[PDB]
């Protein structure tokens, strides 16, 4: 029941790739994401309806943006006046099957919310191991004789007479 | 015009990434190498600064001088079974292999499972009285906070 | 010298004075209300709470630092005094 | 390292989403392979979205401040 993504398509227009394949892609089949009643009353009961969108306040889907090399992007929109298009969501295809393109700040908020919850849960476990005591503290759950100078000096005399030998 | 208005926010938003990596990559090595000599104020100060400056900077770059949070289009267009080296160039080796499902996985707009129960609670606390008593409570508490800041401003001199 | 140690103790005392006021000011400074201009306010309240949590712990650790730095001078004062030093020797 | 295990993965939880944000904002900035379109639509809130969030946010902020004060 969410606008942010469905993956139901029809197998009729999957293998065709052309510039007009997204132009005729408005209401080829029913779909749940394709809004019914006022938006979809132009297709499937009138013929040659593409010139009749403005005379009887029918709503067509967006065909202005179209790329040939990679894939097709179909949209859902609304219009109560001619020469005006305002959408609510974009539905891009990937290898045939559709998906919805979300917003920037919405996915930003839904990702930083999980980030804040993750940081809080990371901070939560740190109290479970450190144990404090006012005296013991914190814990987790798991020379020379001052004659060596002449000792070493005459030992140095021994090193220049018996050196280490390999 | 508008594209530069997006850019002036998103460039600093991804500049915050550099500070976050400089924190976490140092934390990763210092946790393994220096697990001992436990100093709870030392890590509490790091947690406090991470809570303070990063959470203020990403908020000030996402909530003001920014494109509207319902405006822009997040579009994935290219994906391949093999490894696309452009992403490992951008992400500096992060998110490897470049699978087919990892591009839908990138746009993980679905929240945690407990978010469903807190939304259930948000539908549950509306069964009792809401926005009628709590509204005047938060109004009186906003006036109380105004009184408190007046007390501080008259006690600061 | 001795005056350097006196100045160091004075500087850390003034830093202890400054830290407490800096902790109490930022708690109530962030509590002010501002109008939203393309904000998506769902993430700001938890941020304010999570920043309030560390600011109150800053006051707690400031009190702990006061407790420790008082005891730091406690052993400094105890070694050189004259309340009964010249008096209790002959008693 | 047998301790400090969940904190590490919970930090990667914030790492991954922020990396995805960085990658998408570095591919939005590049004009290639990206479609830029100003879609100015408004989502209607059923409730007073600043005020209904202020019903809980400042209350929980003050309550958690008092609780973490009384902790120490």
């Amino acid at each position: 029941d969410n606008l942010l993504g469905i993956s139901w398509v029809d197998s009729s227009w999957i293998p065709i790739l052309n510039s007009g394949s997204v132009l005729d892609y408005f209401s080829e089949r029913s779909n749940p994401f394709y809004d019914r009643t006022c938006n979809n009353e132009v297709v499937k009961m009138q013929r040659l309806t593409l010139e009749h969108l403005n005379q009887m306040v029918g709503i067509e889907y967006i065909l202005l943006h179209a790329q040939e090399p990679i894939l097709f992007i179909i949209r859902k929109q609304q219009r109560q006046s001619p020469a005006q298009v305002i959408p609510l969501a974009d539905y891009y295809i990937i290898a045939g099957v559709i998906y919805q393109a979300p917003d920037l700040g919405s996915v930003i908020n839904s990702r930083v919310l999980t980030a804040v919850h993750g940081i809080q849960s990371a901070f939560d476990e740190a109290m479970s191991y450190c144990r404090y005591h006012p005296s013991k503290g914190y814990w987790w759950h798991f020379s020379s004789i001052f004659q060596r100078q002449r000792v070493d000096a005459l030992l140095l005399d021994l090193r220049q007479k018996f050196p280490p030998k390999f | 015009r508008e594209e530069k208005q997006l850019e002036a926010s998103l460039d600093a938003l991804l500049s915050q990434v550099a500070d976050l990596k400089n924190s976490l990559g140092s934390f990763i090595c210092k946790l393994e190498n220096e697990y001992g000599r436990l100093t709870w104020p030392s890590v509490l100060d790091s947690f406090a600064l991470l809570s303070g400056q990063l959470n203020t900077l990403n908020k000030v770059l996402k909530h003001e001088k920014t494109p509207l949070f319902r405006n822009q289009v997040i579009i994935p267009l290219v994906l391949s079974p093999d490894r696309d080296e452009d992403l490992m160039r951008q992400t500096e080796g992060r998110v490897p292999v470049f699978s087919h499902e990892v591009v839908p996985d990138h746009l993980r707009t679905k929240p945690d499972p407990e978010v469903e129960e807190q939304e259930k609670q948000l539908t549950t606390d509306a069964a009792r009285i809401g926005a009628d008593a709590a509204q005047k409570q938060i109004q009186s508490l906003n006036k109380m906070c105004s009184n408190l800041l007046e007390k501080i401003s008259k006690e600061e001199r | 010298s001795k005056e350097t140690l006196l100045q160091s103790y004075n500087k850390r005392l003034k830093d202890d004075i400054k830290s407490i006021m800096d902790n109490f000011t930022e708690i109530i400074k962030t509590a002010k209300i501002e109008d939203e201009t393309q904000v998506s306010r769902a993430t700001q309240g938890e941020q304010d709470n999570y920043e309030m949590h560390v600011r109150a712990a800053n006051i707690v650790r400031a009190g702990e630092s006061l407790m420790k730095l008082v005891s730091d001078l406690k052993q400094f004062l105890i070694l050189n005094d004259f309340p009964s030093v010249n008096e209790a020797i002959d008693q | 390292l047998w301790p400090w295990d969940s904190v590490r993965n919970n930090l990667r939880s914030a790492l991954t989403e922020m990396c995805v944000l960085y990658d998408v904002l570095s591919i939005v900035r590049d004009k290639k392979f990206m479609t830029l379109d100003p879609v100015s639509q408004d989502a209607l809130p059923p409730k007073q979205n600043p005020q209904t969030l202020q019903l809980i946010s400042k209350k929980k902020s003050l309550a958690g401040a008092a609780q973490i004060l009384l902790k120490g």
Side-chain angles (χ1 to χ4, degrees), chain B residues 118-137:
Chain B
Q118 68 86 30
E119 288 301 319
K120 186 254 290 180
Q121 194 267 330
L122 282 176
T123 63
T124 308
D125 57 354
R128 53 97 175 173
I129 47 171
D132 56 356
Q135 188 63 74
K136 61 95 175 179
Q137 290 180 357

Side-chain angles (χ1 to χ4, degrees), chain B residues 18-44:
Chain B
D19 186 24
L20 189 142
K21 302 301 169 284
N22 212 347
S23 314
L24 294 188
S26 53
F27 185 78
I28 282 153
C29 63
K30 254 66 189 174
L31 182 54
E32 296 153 40
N33 301 7
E34 282 95 9
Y35 160 68
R37 51 103 176 175
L38 72 164
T39 45
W40 184 247
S42 298
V43 289
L44 193 146

Side-chain angles (χ1 to χ4, degrees), chain B residues 17 20 29 34-35 42 82 85 87-88 103 115 134 150 157:
Chain B
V17 172
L20 189 142
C29 63
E34 282 95 9
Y35 160 68
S42 298
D82 51 2
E85 65 265 13
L87 189 151
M88 283 73 74
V103 180
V115 191
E150 280 162 353
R157 49 182 173 268

Side-chain angles (χ1 to χ4, degrees), chain D residues 40-56:
Chain D
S40 191
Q41 92 268 357
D42 267 4
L44 73 164
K47 294 175 73 68
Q48 276 177 26
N49 200 9
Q51 287 105 331
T52 52
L53 286 172
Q54 272 157 359
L55 294 175
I56 55 171

Side-chain angles (χ1 to χ4, degrees), chain A:
Chain A
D1 57 355
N2 195 5
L3 275 80
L4 310 166
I6 66 165
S7 279
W8 202 354
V9 291
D10 195 16
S11 302
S12 56
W13 288 0
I14 309 297
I16 50 168
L17 281 73
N18 55 88
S19 173
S21 176
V22 73
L23 304 182
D24 62 347
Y25 210 66
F26 38 94
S27 184
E28 181 257 324
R29 74 278 189 191
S30 297
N31 294 117
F33 85 109
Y34 277 141
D35 45 352
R36 291 288 298 165
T37 310
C38 198
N39 207 315
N40 216 349
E41 53 90 18
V42 290
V43 188
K44 303 150 177 275
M45 72 291 291
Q46 292 82 16
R47 306 277 84 80
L48 186 63
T49 185
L50 271 299
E51 308 309 304
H52 296 285
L53 277 297
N54 292 317
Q55 77 163 7
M56 60 80 71
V57 74
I59 298 100
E60 91 271 7
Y61 302 101
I62 313 186
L63 318 171
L64 177 62
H65 167 58
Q67 60 178 1
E68 63 272 15
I70 310 165
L71 58 89
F72 307 134
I73 303 107
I74 194 66
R75 273 83 59 189
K76 51 184 284 278
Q77 65 102 13
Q78 49 185 355
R79 34 179 282 274
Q80 320 303 315
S81 58
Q84 196 270 332
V85 175
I86 185 67
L88 270 175
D90 309 343
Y91 266 81
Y92 63 100
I93 75 168
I94 291 296
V97 294
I98 51 169
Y99 208 79
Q100 190 259 9
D103 306 339
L104 176 64
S106 302
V107 74
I108 278 170
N109 293 123
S110 67
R111 277 172 311 180
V112 302
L113 185 143
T114 54
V116 168
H117 294 345
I119 295 177
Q120 176 96 52
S121 62
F123 184 51
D124 283 334
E125 202 198 10
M127 281 325 317
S128 59
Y129 296 139
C130 50
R131 298 176 280 179
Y132 176 64
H133 203 268
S135 305
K136 300 179 182 177
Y138 292 99
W139 60 87
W140 293 125
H141 205 300
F142 307 97
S143 87
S144 168
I145 63 184
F146 271 10
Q147 191 178 336
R148 312 290 191 199
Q149 52 267 17
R150 56 175 291 202
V151 168
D152 295 331
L154 191 152
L155 271 191
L156 187 136
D157 186 74
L158 265 70
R159 297 291 85 74
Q160 72 104 31
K161 179 249 295 178
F162 286 107
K165 306 173 186 57
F166 60 95

Side-chain angles (χ1 to χ4, degrees), chain A residues 4 86-90 100-109, chain B residues 2 62 66-74, chain C residues 36-41, chain D residues 37-46 49:
Chain A
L4 310 166
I86 185 67
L88 270 175
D90 309 343
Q100 190 259 9
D103 306 339
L104 176 64
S106 302
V107 74
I108 278 170
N109 293 123
Chain B
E2 197 209 9
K62 89 191 173 185
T66 180
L68 172 64
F69 49 90
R70 297 157 291 178
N71 269 2
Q72 295 316 298
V73 182
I74 292 297
Chain C
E36 52 158 354
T37 58
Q38 299 173 355
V39 168
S40 79
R41 290 266 294 111
Chain D
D37 193 80
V39 191
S40 191
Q41 92 268 357
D42 267 4
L44 73 164
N49 200 9

